[PDB]
């Protein structure tokens, strides 16, 4: 699977819904043919891999242990409660493949909020101890680059890459070892809305003429003043984004959204 | 020669989720199976005392393959709960978002997912492309050039030569392989065609996020409709319907001719994979509180008794645990339903699974494209039928052919090609709706301190059912009963192998270290664990 020319990547799914996945199948120039054919290797990915089975054992096994090195890239939560029972893949815990994995790779990216911070699964009371990687594999000195998002734009899964593989080097992080250079703004500073806020202007309904001509959505709980991301500017599958389909922002972006966010109608 | 022992496919590649399948074969041939979810969240754990708007969020994030899915299902659910009766548009876009879904779902299913079942990739490097233009331009209007395929041999070429093969790395037809039978020529259309449906389904998933802001994971629903006031603009229905064009085009012209190619040339594959039961939904309503109302309509049939639809009775459906790793072995209808985990391991205390077993009237019954199509062909549908019987008249089959493996891929391309078609008359409505001055999207509602609720959807899977217990206007008890679910959960209280269980039973496997006889059934199902599991 793997040899010189094009780098490895090593695509690893724990306690995950799959979107992660499927956003970045969304990838737009590049498009994800392009990445697969000659910007990467895929060389180990559950959802569109040929190989099953032990074939797949093999294959994660060859590519993780190749001289050439590899990336890797994870989606999901580490179940962490009874021994880490509540996840396992070939009969192995989440928490015990991702210890051995992940201290091997030359870099680590955690894609998704689950992958980041523990998200869904981890939020109250949180039944299988779901942890995000860093929080989980602090004590093996794990320290992944979080790409937050519930999923995340596949515009800066890309972009971070292509920044590690030009440069040889993370991308300036924030607190919370996000990219500054996708995070480092609220939601909220980027909204074609903001003048309405600023004018107190508010939808008081969904089914207002306010709303429909447009109001801001801060009392009908948007999170985008406390969130941050790319959304406004970057938008989705080339077209639109939560606002401008007049739903508020849920801070999906943000390490416990889950229940830090909650209510979602309301601030 | 023939094997005899056990195999044990885990993870089980090319699907959503984390599946562990056990199967017992004797003599080249599967005789006891075993269907076994790895991972287990408990969103219905996470869910109680929580405000009833906030459910769609938390559900959604069950799958991100049926994305928007679970979203609608809550929705359905609480504003069932709360008693409101939505905007005729809002009807309309929750349709409208729904139906290029089923598009993008299954388009991707067949190339993406299945098709590497059937298809082997290398041989496609000896393929003449004068020879493969020829094939490709007559079995689709749409005619395909010598030069066309080169371009993709050449591509292809350049990327196995540099021994890097990624994704196809310890692929089951690698060196050849027994089971797989397609000529060259055949096998460089498919791979042709897989490529061009990797840029095709972006446009495909673009049309949803048209009106329901981004995809994965969808943000336009709200108790009482929705929220797009942009949807009701010409220029966004301009850019919906253009994108839906282009889809059907595909469908028309390259997924159905590519399925019809494949399936004649598989057509052993009519005589494994058959189930007894079926349930459906039904869906793309016209009232919200009348399952009938749905272009497409509920039903269940037992023993594949097509001439006696019964009718579909919410109250007959109990999941069990006894097979399960959850506490005790009492099965519970939905809305008195428990999720209180205890693992014992593979097989411990006979255990063997994260799922739970539903049983309609006590039976295990197959949900999805084989239930939905079979069902509204016996109930007179007038489209379904249309579709069907060409496609068999195309094969040189009879009916009987449905009930298996090749049956489920051939009635999920059916499936495919009707909708494709309905939405534009989905489209003509709303338009046609616009135009007498309709432009509400949104009903006013009030939240009851106590009260009950069920949300039904039929997803590209199957029959989806959302269930809410309120108390003191808060989540009292809130359970998801899924199509996958359904169809690979365990065996129940008495000991009822489930759908993929029994259909896998007679399987023949050439090889046992490449087991792709086992992946072609379990991949017909089209299985999605995190949405069986939550
Ligand atoms: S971050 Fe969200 S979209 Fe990604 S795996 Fe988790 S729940 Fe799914
Ligand atoms: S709609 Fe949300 S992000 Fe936009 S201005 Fe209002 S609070 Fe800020
Ligand atoms: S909900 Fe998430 S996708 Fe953007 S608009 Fe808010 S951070
Ligand atoms: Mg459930």
Same mark, same amino acid.
């Given at each position: ?267 | ?12 590649? *090319? ?183 990797? *840029? ?68 052993? &594959? ?80 006979? *255990? ?6 539903? *049983? ?106 959302? &269930? ?67």
């Amino acid at each position: 699977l793997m040899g010189p020319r094009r780098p490895s990547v090593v695509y690893l799914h724990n306690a995950e819904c799959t979107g992660c996945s499927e956003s970045v199948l969304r990838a737009f120039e590049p498009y994800i043919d392009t990445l697969i054919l000659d910007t990467l290797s895929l060389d180990y990915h559950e959802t569109i891999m040929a190989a099953a089975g032990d074939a797949a054992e093999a294959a994660l096994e060859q590519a993780v242990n190749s001289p050439h090195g590899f990336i890797a890239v994870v989606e999901g939560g580490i179940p962490t409660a009874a021994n880490g029972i509540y996840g396992k893949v070939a009969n192995h815990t989440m928490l015990d493949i991702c210890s051995r994995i992940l201290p091997k790779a030359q870099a680590v990216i955690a894609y998704g909020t689950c992958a980041t911070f523990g998200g869904v699964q981890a939020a109250k009371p949180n039944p299988t101890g779901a942890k995000g990687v860093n929080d989980a594999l602090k004590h093996l000195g794990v320290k992944a680059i979080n790409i937050a998002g519930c999923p995340p734009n596949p515009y800066n899964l890309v972009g971070t890459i292509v920044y590690y593989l030009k440069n040889k080097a993370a991308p300036e992080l924030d607190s919370l070892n996000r990219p500054t250079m996708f995070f480092g703004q609220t939601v909220h500073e980027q909204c074609p809305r903001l003048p309405h806020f600023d004018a107190g202007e508010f939808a008081p309904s969904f089914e207002s003429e306010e709303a429909r001509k447009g109001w801001c959505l801060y009392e009908l709980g948007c999170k985008g003043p406390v969130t941050m991301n790319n959304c406004p500017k970057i938008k989705f599958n080339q077209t639109n984004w939560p606002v401008d389909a007049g739903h508020p922002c849920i801070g999906c972006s943000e390490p416990d959204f889950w229940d830090a966010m909650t209510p979602f109608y309301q601030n | 020669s023939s094997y005899s022992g056990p195999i044990v496919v885990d993870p089980v590649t *090319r699907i959503e989720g984390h599946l562990r399948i056990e199967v017992e074969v004797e003599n080249g041939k599967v005789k006891n199976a075993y269907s076994s979810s790895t991972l287990f969240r408990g969103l219905e754990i996470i869910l109680k005392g929580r405000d009833p708007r906030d459910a769609q969020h938390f559900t959604q994030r069950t799958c991100g393959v049926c994305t928007y899915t679970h979203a609608l299902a809550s929705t359905r659910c609480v504003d069932n709960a709360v008693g409101v009766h939505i905007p005729k548009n809002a009807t309309y876009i929750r349709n409208l978002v729904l139906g290029a879904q089923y598009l993008h779902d299954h388009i991707v299913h067949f190339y993406h997912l299945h098709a590497l079942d059937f298809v082997d990739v290398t041989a496609a490097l000896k393929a003449d492309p004068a020879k493969a233009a020829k094939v490709a331009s007559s079995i689709s209007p749409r005619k395909t050039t010598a030069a066309d395929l080169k371009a993709v041999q050449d591509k292809l070429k350049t990327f196995v030569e540099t021994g890097q093969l990624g994704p196809f790395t310890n692929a089951y037809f690698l060196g050849g392989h027994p089971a797989y039978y397609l000529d060259p020529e055949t096998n460089l259309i498919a791979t042709a065609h897989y490529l061009e449906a990797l *840029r095709l389904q972006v446009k495909a998933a673009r049309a949803m996020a048209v009106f329901g802001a981004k995809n994965p994971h969808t943000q336009f629903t709200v108790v009482g409709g929705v929220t797009c006031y942009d949807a009701l603009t010409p220029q966004r229905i301009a850019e919906f319907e253009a994108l839906w064009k282009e889809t059907k085009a595909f469908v028309d012209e390259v997924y159905i001719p590519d399925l019809l190619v494949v399936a004649a040339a598989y057509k052993d &594959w009519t005589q494994y994979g058959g189930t007894d039961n079926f349930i459906t939904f039904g869906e793309f309503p016209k009232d919200e509180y009348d399952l009938n109302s749905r272009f497409f309509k509920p039903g269940v049939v037992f023993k594949r008794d097509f001439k006696n639809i019964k009718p579909f009775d919410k109250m007959q459906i109990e999941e069990h645990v006894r097979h399960s790793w959850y506490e005790g072995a009492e099965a519970r209808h939905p809305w008195k339903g428990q999720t209180q985990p205890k693992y014992t391991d593979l097989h411990g205390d006979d *255990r063997y699974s994260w799922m739970k077993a539903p *049983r309609y009237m006590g039976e295990p019954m197959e949900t999805g494209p084989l239930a939905q199509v079979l069902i509204a062909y016996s109930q007179g549908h007038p489209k379904v039928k249309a579709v069907t019987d060409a496609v068999l008249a195309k094969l040189g089959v009879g009916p009987e052919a449905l009930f298996s493996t090749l049956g489920r891929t051939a009635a999920r391309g059916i499936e495919t090609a009707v909708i494709a078609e309905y939405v534009g008359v989905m489209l003509q409505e709303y338009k046609d709706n616009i135009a007498k001055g309709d432009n509400v999207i949104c009903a006013p509602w009030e939240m009851p301190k106590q009260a009950e609720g069920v949300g039904f959807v039929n997803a590209p899977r199957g029959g989806l059912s959302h &269930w809410i217990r309120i108390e003191d206007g808060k989540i009292g008890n809130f359970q998801l009963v899924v199509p996958s679910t359904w169809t690979l959960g365990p065996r129940c209280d008495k000991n009822n192998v489930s759908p993929v269980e029994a259909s896998l039973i007679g399987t023949p496997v050439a090889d046992a270290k490449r087991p792709v006889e086992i992946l072609r059934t379990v991949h017909s199902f089209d299985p999605c664990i995190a949405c069986g599991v939550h």
